[PDB]
Amino acid sequence: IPTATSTTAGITKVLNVLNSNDVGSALSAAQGKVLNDKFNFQNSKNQSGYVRLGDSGLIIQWGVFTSTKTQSNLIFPLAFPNALLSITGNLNSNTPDVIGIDFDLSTATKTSIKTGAAQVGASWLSGKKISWIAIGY
Amino acid sequence: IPTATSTTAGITKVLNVLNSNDVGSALSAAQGKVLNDKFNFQNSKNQSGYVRLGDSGLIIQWGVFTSTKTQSNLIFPLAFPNALLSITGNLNSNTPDVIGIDFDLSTATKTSIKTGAAQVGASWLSGKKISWIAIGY
Amino acid sequence: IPTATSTTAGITKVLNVLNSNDVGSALSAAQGKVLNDKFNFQNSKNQSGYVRLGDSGLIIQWGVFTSTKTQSNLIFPLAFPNALLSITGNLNSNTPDVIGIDFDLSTATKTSIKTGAAQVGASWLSGKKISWIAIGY
Ligand SMILES: [Br-]
Ligand SMILES: [Br-]
Ligand SMILES: [Br-]
Ligand SMILES: [Br-]
Ligand SMILES: [Br-]
Ligand SMILES: [Br-]
Ligand SMILES: [Br-]
Ligand SMILES: [Br-]
Ligand SMILES: [Br-]
Ligand SMILES: [Br-]
Ligand SMILES: [Br-]
Ligand SMILES: [Br-]
Ligand SMILES: [Br-]
Ligand SMILES: [Br-]
Ligand SMILES: [Br-]
Ligand SMILES: [Br-]
Ligand SMILES: [Br-]
Ligand SMILES: [Br-]
Ligand SMILES: [Br-]
Ligand SMILES: [Br-]
Ligand SMILES: [Br-]
Ligand SMILES: [Br-]
Ligand SMILES: [Br-]
Ligand SMILES: [Br-]
Ligand SMILES: [Br-]
Ligand SMILES: [Br-]
Ligand SMILES: [Br-]
Ligand SMILES: [Br-]
Ligand SMILES: [Br-]
Ligand SMILES: [Br-]
Ligand SMILES: [Br-]
Ligand SMILES: [Br-]
Ligand SMILES: [Br-]
Ligand SMILES: [Br-]
Ligand SMILES: [Br-]
Ligand SMILES: [Br-]
Ligand SMILES: [Br-]
Ligand SMILES: [Br-]
Ligand SMILES: [Br-]
Ligand SMILES: [Br-]
Ligand SMILES: [Br-]
Ligand SMILES: [Br-]
Ligand SMILES: [Br-]
Ligand SMILES: [Br-]
Ligand SMILES: [Br-]
Ligand SMILES: [Br-]
Ligand SMILES: [Br-]
Ligand SMILES: [Br-]
Ligand SMILES: [Br-]
Ligand SMILES: [Br-]
Ligand SMILES: [Br-]
Ligand SMILES: [Br-]
Ligand SMILES: [Br-]
Ligand SMILES: [Br-]
Ligand SMILES: [Br-]
Ligand SMILES: [Br-]
Ligand SMILES: [Br-]
Ligand SMILES: [Br-]
Ligand SMILES: [Br-]
Ligand SMILES: [Br-]
Ligand code: NA
Ligand code: NA
Ligand code: NA
Ligand code: NA
Ligand code: NA
Ligand code: NA
Ligand code: NA
Structure with a gap:
C-alpha cells in the first residue's frame, strides 16, 4: 500500500x-x-477593554477614565503581564476646552498609571472624561 | 486496510x-x-482607513480630519457595527500651537463623532488638521 | 483502494x-x-517598538520620544515600507502641564516625522517626554 x-x-x-x-x-x-x-483573539468589549494581538504578546487596551483632583490611578482593564509600553488619550467634551492629558509613564505599574487632566496655568481638574488607547505586553 | x-x-x-x-x-x-x-485581515490603506483585528470583532480606524468652525462630524472610514469604544488624536502642524483635540464621545454614533480643535481661551478653530486613531466594533 | x-x-x-x-x-x-x-506576529517589545498586524500590511508602532528645542525627527522603530498613516501622542509628566504634542504629518518620511512639544504662547520646549502610538504600512 x-x-x-x-x-x-x-x-x-x-x-x-x-x-x-x-x-x-x-x-x-x-x-x-x-x-x-x-x-x-482574546478580548473584552467593555467600555474599558482590551484585545490580545494574536500570540505576539502585545495587548491593546482602551477606556474612558474620569479625572480626579490629583494625578491618580487609571486602572487597566487587564493587568499587563510585563508592562505598559505606550498610552495616548484625549478629552471628551462638547465645549472648546484645552486640557493637558498627562500620564506619569515613569511610575506606571502592571495594573495602573497615574493620569490627570491639567488646566492651563493651574493644577489638576476633576471630573474630566478622557478616552485613551494603550499598548503593552 | x-x-x-x-x-x-x-x-x-x-x-x-x-x-x-x-x-x-x-x-x-x-x-x-x-x-x-x-x-x-480586511482593511483599507486609505488616508482614513481601518483594519479588522482578525475575528475578534475589534476594528482599528485612523485618519486625518480637518476641523471646522464648530465641533462637527468626523465620519469613520467604516461604520462600526456596534460602537466606537475609544479615540485619540493630535494636531498636525509645523508651528508650536497648543490646540485642544476634543471628541464628544457621549454623542458618537456608529458612523461619526463630533470633533473639534479648541483654542486656548476661545472657541473652535477651523482648518486644523488632526491625525486620529480609534478602536471599536 | x-x-x-x-x-x-x-x-x-x-x-x-x-x-x-x-x-x-x-x-x-x-x-x-x-x-x-x-x-x-513579527514585533519588537523595545521601549520604542512595533507589531505587524498579521499579513494585512498594517504595522502599529509606539515609543517614547524626547523633545528638543525645535520640531525635530522622531525616528520610527521600523521604517514603514510605504508610509505612516496616523500618529497620536501625549505628554508624560507628574506635573499639571498643558503642552501641544504636534506632528508635521505633511512632511513625514518612511523613517521619521517632525515632532515637537509646544508651550502655550511660546515656542518649542526641549526635554519633554512624549508617549506615542502610530499606524502605517
Ligand atoms: Br510539498
Ligand atoms: Br508516516
Ligand atoms: Br489571542
Ligand atoms: Br468543539
Ligand atoms: Br468598563
Ligand atoms: Br498543540
Ligand atoms: Br514547536
Ligand atoms: Br519546529
Ligand atoms: Br520543533
Ligand atoms: Br464614564
Ligand atoms: Br476628586
Ligand atoms: Br490614586
Ligand atoms: Br486605586
Ligand atoms: Br487582570
Ligand atoms: Br480653554
Ligand atoms: Br514620565
Ligand atoms: Br513592576
Ligand atoms: Br507592578
Ligand atoms: Br516588577
Ligand atoms: Br477640579
Ligand atoms: Br494526537
Ligand atoms: Br473516518
Ligand atoms: Br479579517
Ligand atoms: Br483559489
Ligand atoms: Br480617505
Ligand atoms: Br468552514
Ligand atoms: Br463550531
Ligand atoms: Br466544536
Ligand atoms: Br462544534
Ligand atoms: Br487632508
Ligand atoms: Br468651517
Ligand atoms: Br456636523
Ligand atoms: Br456630516
Ligand atoms: Br461603512
Ligand atoms: Br499656542
Ligand atoms: Br463625552
Ligand atoms: Br445607535
Ligand atoms: Br448610529
Ligand atoms: Br443604536
Ligand atoms: Br477659525
Ligand atoms: Br466538504
Ligand atoms: Br489525489
Ligand atoms: Br507577522
Ligand atoms: Br521546526
Ligand atoms: Br527603544
Ligand atoms: Br506555502
Ligand atoms: Br494563492
Ligand atoms: Br486560490
Ligand atoms: Br490559486
Ligand atoms: Br526615555
Ligand atoms: Br535641544
Ligand atoms: Br531633526
Ligand atoms: Br535625525
Ligand atoms: Br527599519
Ligand atoms: Br500649564
Ligand atoms: Br501636517
Ligand atoms: Br517617500
Ligand atoms: Br522616505
Ligand atoms: Br518615496
Ligand atoms: Br526649552
Ligand atoms: Na507520508
Ligand atoms: Na511520488
Ligand atoms: Na493628545
Ligand atoms: Na482516522
Ligand atoms: Na496505532
Ligand atoms: Na481525494
Ligand atoms: Na463517498
Missing part, C-alpha cells in the same frame, strides 16, 4: 497537534478548527 | 471545512490556504 | 504548502505548525 506524499496518494497518519513539523502526515480537521478559532 | 490515527498510517477522510472537531480525519490543503489567507 | 473524500476514507496526498486550493488532498501537520506560528 503506497505511503502518502505530495506527489502520490497513499496511507497517512493524522496528527492532532499544532507543534509537529512532520511534512508527510496530515493535520487533523480538528486542528484546522483550533487554528480558525484562534483568529478570535 | 488500516484506519489513520496519530500512531498508525492508514486511510482517512479529507474534510474541507474549518468547523469540524474530528481528530481522526485530515484537513484539506484548501482549508490550509483559507486559514493562511485569513491572516490578511 | 478508495480515494479519500469528505464522505469516504481512502488514500490521499499530503501537501506541504499553504497556497493550494486542492479540496481532496490533506494539509501536512507541518503546515498546521507554520499557521500556528504565524499568530506570533
Whole structure:
C-alpha cells in the first residue's frame, strides 16, 4: 500500500497537534478548527477593554477614565503581564476646552498609571472624561 | 486496510471545512490556504482607513480630519457595527500651537463623532488638521 | 483502494504548502505548525517598538520620544515600507502641564516625522517626554 506524499496518494497518519513539523502526515480537521478559532483573539468589549494581538504578546487596551483632583490611578482593564509600553488619550467634551492629558509613564505599574487632566496655568481638574488607547505586553 | 490515527498510517477522510472537531480525519490543503489567507485581515490603506483585528470583532480606524468652525462630524472610514469604544488624536502642524483635540464621545454614533480643535481661551478653530486613531466594533 | 473524500476514507496526498486550493488532498501537520506560528506576529517589545498586524500590511508602532528645542525627527522603530498613516501622542509628566504634542504629518518620511512639544504662547520646549502610538504600512 503506497505511503502518502505530495506527489502520490497513499496511507497517512493524522496528527492532532499544532507543534509537529512532520511534512508527510496530515493535520487533523480538528486542528484546522483550533487554528480558525484562534483568529478570535482574546478580548473584552467593555467600555474599558482590551484585545490580545494574536500570540505576539502585545495587548491593546482602551477606556474612558474620569479625572480626579490629583494625578491618580487609571486602572487597566487587564493587568499587563510585563508592562505598559505606550498610552495616548484625549478629552471628551462638547465645549472648546484645552486640557493637558498627562500620564506619569515613569511610575506606571502592571495594573495602573497615574493620569490627570491639567488646566492651563493651574493644577489638576476633576471630573474630566478622557478616552485613551494603550499598548503593552 | 488500516484506519489513520496519530500512531498508525492508514486511510482517512479529507474534510474541507474549518468547523469540524474530528481528530481522526485530515484537513484539506484548501482549508490550509483559507486559514493562511485569513491572516490578511480586511482593511483599507486609505488616508482614513481601518483594519479588522482578525475575528475578534475589534476594528482599528485612523485618519486625518480637518476641523471646522464648530465641533462637527468626523465620519469613520467604516461604520462600526456596534460602537466606537475609544479615540485619540493630535494636531498636525509645523508651528508650536497648543490646540485642544476634543471628541464628544457621549454623542458618537456608529458612523461619526463630533470633533473639534479648541483654542486656548476661545472657541473652535477651523482648518486644523488632526491625525486620529480609534478602536471599536 | 478508495480515494479519500469528505464522505469516504481512502488514500490521499499530503501537501506541504499553504497556497493550494486542492479540496481532496490533506494539509501536512507541518503546515498546521507554520499557521500556528504565524499568530506570533513579527514585533519588537523595545521601549520604542512595533507589531505587524498579521499579513494585512498594517504595522502599529509606539515609543517614547524626547523633545528638543525645535520640531525635530522622531525616528520610527521600523521604517514603514510605504508610509505612516496616523500618529497620536501625549505628554508624560507628574506635573499639571498643558503642552501641544504636534506632528508635521505633511512632511513625514518612511523613517521619521517632525515632532515637537509646544508651550502655550511660546515656542518649542526641549526635554519633554512624549508617549506615542502610530499606524502605517
Ligand atoms: Br489525489
Ligand atoms: Br494526537
Ligand atoms: Br498543540
Ligand atoms: Br514547536
Ligand atoms: Br521546526
Ligand atoms: Br519546529
Ligand atoms: Br520543533
Ligand atoms: Br489571542
Ligand atoms: Br468598563
Ligand atoms: Br464614564
Ligand atoms: Br476628586
Ligand atoms: Br490614586
Ligand atoms: Br486605586
Ligand atoms: Br487582570
Ligand atoms: Br480653554
Ligand atoms: Br514620565
Ligand atoms: Br513592576
Ligand atoms: Br507592578
Ligand atoms: Br516588577
Ligand atoms: Br477640579
Ligand atoms: Br508516516
Ligand atoms: Br466538504
Ligand atoms: Br468552514
Ligand atoms: Br463550531
Ligand atoms: Br468543539
Ligand atoms: Br466544536
Ligand atoms: Br462544534
Ligand atoms: Br479579517
Ligand atoms: Br480617505
Ligand atoms: Br487632508
Ligand atoms: Br468651517
Ligand atoms: Br456636523
Ligand atoms: Br456630516
Ligand atoms: Br461603512
Ligand atoms: Br499656542
Ligand atoms: Br463625552
Ligand atoms: Br445607535
Ligand atoms: Br448610529
Ligand atoms: Br443604536
Ligand atoms: Br477659525
Ligand atoms: Br473516518
Ligand atoms: Br510539498
Ligand atoms: Br506555502
Ligand atoms: Br494563492
Ligand atoms: Br483559489
Ligand atoms: Br486560490
Ligand atoms: Br490559486
Ligand atoms: Br507577522
Ligand atoms: Br527603544
Ligand atoms: Br526615555
Ligand atoms: Br535641544
Ligand atoms: Br531633526
Ligand atoms: Br535625525
Ligand atoms: Br527599519
Ligand atoms: Br500649564
Ligand atoms: Br501636517
Ligand atoms: Br517617500
Ligand atoms: Br522616505
Ligand atoms: Br518615496
Ligand atoms: Br526649552
Ligand atoms: Na511520488
Ligand atoms: Na507520508
Ligand atoms: Na493628545
Ligand atoms: Na496505532
Ligand atoms: Na482516522
Ligand atoms: Na463517498
Ligand atoms: Na481525494
